[PDB]
From Swiss-Prot, chain B:
It is linked to Developmental and epileptic encephalopathy 31A: An autosomal dominant epileptic encephalopathy, a heterogeneous group of severe early-onset epilepsies characterized by refractory seizures, neurodevelopmental impairment, and poor prognosis. Development is normal prior to seizure onset, after which cognitive and motor delays become apparent. The modification Phosphoserine is found at S288. The lineage of its organism: Eukaryota, Metazoa, Chordata, Craniata, Vertebrata. Residues 24-276 form the Dynamin-type G domain. This is Dynamin-1. Catalyzes the hydrolysis of GTP and utilizes this energy to mediate vesicle scission and participates in many forms of endocytosis, such as clathrin-mediated endocytosis or synaptic vesicle endocytosis as well as rapid endocytosis (RE). Associates to the membrane, through lipid binding, and self-assembles into rings and stacks of interconnected rings through oligomerization to form a helical polymer around the vesicle membrane leading to constriction of invaginated coated pits around their necks. Residues 126-129 are annotated as: G3 motif. The modification 3'-nitrotyrosine is found at Y115. Phosphorylated by CDK5 leading to synaptic vesicle endocytosis (SVE) activation. It is found in: Cell membrane; Membrane, Clathrin-coated pit; Cytoplasmic vesicle; Presynapse. The modification Phosphotyrosine is found at Y73, Y115.
Amino acid sequence: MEDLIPLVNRLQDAFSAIGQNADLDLPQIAVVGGQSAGKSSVLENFVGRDFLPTRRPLVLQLVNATTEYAEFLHSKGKKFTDFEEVRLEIEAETDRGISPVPINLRVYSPHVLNLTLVDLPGMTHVPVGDQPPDIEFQIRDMLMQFVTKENCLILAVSPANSDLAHSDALKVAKEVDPQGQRTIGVITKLDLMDEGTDARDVLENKLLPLRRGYIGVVNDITAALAAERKFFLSHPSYRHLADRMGTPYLQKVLNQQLTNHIRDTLPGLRNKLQSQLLSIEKEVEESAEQAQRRDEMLRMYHALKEALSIIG
Amino acid sequence: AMEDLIPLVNRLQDAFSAIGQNADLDLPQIAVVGGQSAGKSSVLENFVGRDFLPRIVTRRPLVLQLVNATTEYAEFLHSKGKKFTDFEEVRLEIEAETDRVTKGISPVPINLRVYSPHVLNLTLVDLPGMTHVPVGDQPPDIEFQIRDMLMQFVTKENCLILAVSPANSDLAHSDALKVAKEVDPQGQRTIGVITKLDLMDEGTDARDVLENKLLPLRRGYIGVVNRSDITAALAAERKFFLSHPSYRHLADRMGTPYLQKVLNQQLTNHIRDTLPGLRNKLQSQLLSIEKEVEEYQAQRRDEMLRMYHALKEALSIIGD
Ligand SMILES: [Cl-]
Ligand SMILES: [Cl-]
Ligand SMILES: [Zn+2]
Ligand SMILES: [Zn+2]
Ligand SMILES: [Zn+2]
Ligand SMILES: [Zn+2]
């Protein structure tokens, strides 16, 4: 089943066309991190190009393919070769506070595996620029709409070179998933720890256990990936773990865990979407509010019908 | 701004430490506050030029009384006469004296005179590193025990707060600044130390913090680096600040020699300003405890008499 991740990408597109994602409990990986956790670099190392500026969710659909381009759902036909204009388009579509309405970005490339990640805004604490006083709360509350849903896997990104108790990602993950059953740990910045310290206890799954494990990473992609591989092979604390460390390994294990997760939950999703259809089918058998309520219901009907056709 | 003011307060600290007291007397002093991974120990050890702290390093306050001298040695108040030349035995004695009282936290100070050519005339009250999860055989409420004990010091108006934060994490995560913001929301008695400037991400810097723009403090922020042989470490730090393009213009108000100088100056000035106010408060405390003591559990009565005598001793040290 090379088609399972693509199948769910089509489900994501169907619901993103009507500005929906979080409420439908789709099987997906949400990427969670504090603003200084190194989340952006993890995603850019998967793509192998710099493309991030965020105030909305980015449904980043990496597709294995012979040809290399990017495609936004909201401008359906336009093929993107320049990832500098991909960055500009993310900013542009965002300006179209915080919103849970997803931006869907499909990247085709032979350097990527079949993998989809829902990147959520970095957690912050102090307002900067024209952000409101409660920006911390707005971001955290929007994150919660995604990560409270049972089919959401949490990619919890934490820096190695700070106390793990300070991790914004793990504070969120502990709240919604206290048993650590759907949280995958990413440990960044292992090259920027203090002299005579290491994160071996975390990376060996001993300090704060997660069922799905911890993967270490370090941030011209070919040179960057080469330097990462060389770091893990050279470092005496991480020599023995080296073949389950780094961004290629991380990308591989997420492909495997997402594929298996979609396999487990997609039949349950069909049932839940069917119950939603039966409920909304009863509802269908005028102010600006009342018209807007009718239009939203019809858009939802269309997305559900499109989605059920994808599942088959 | 007299050179005898820090020594005067050292005598006050010794008088009250002899009866197991410090925090409740509101002495003019610098409390050193930091999260367990903020680099607080390295800041103090780079002043001294020797490794001597545990490696919540400590479970009691350390009244570190630094004295400029030709030789390197230490003297504990509790162990009168005994000179410590081995700083490895200094680390052991801190731990040993801690276990003599305490596996939780106590506010009862350990007074340590450190003689070294690497130090200026300076006293610092080092408080336990803040932690969030108990490790080893530390009790379940260790986070609360540390934070509550810290508060007994830093809520007092004459306490200057030396807030140690790492540069290579979000400044909003600083345990030190969270504490300082609570007790000193206007930032009038908080001195910022920014550590680990050499371990930040590529293409980032802490210039906005170090220029006092991001989270303003009246008394300023000082950047340091531990690239550790103290002479070689200090040389490498000086070279870092001079070389780095974000910090070139600030270089002469950065680093450990500068930090040590500015703390000497700020403490001396602070002792001068508050000493008349301290006399009045200690006099009121004496008059109050004299009414309690006027008929001169037994151990509870002993503590009241000890405090009475310490106040008289302290007022005599301050004079007129
Ligand atoms: Cl974080
Ligand atoms: Cl901290
Ligand atoms: Zn944060
Ligand atoms: Zn339709
Ligand atoms: Zn902390
Ligand atoms: Zn009374």
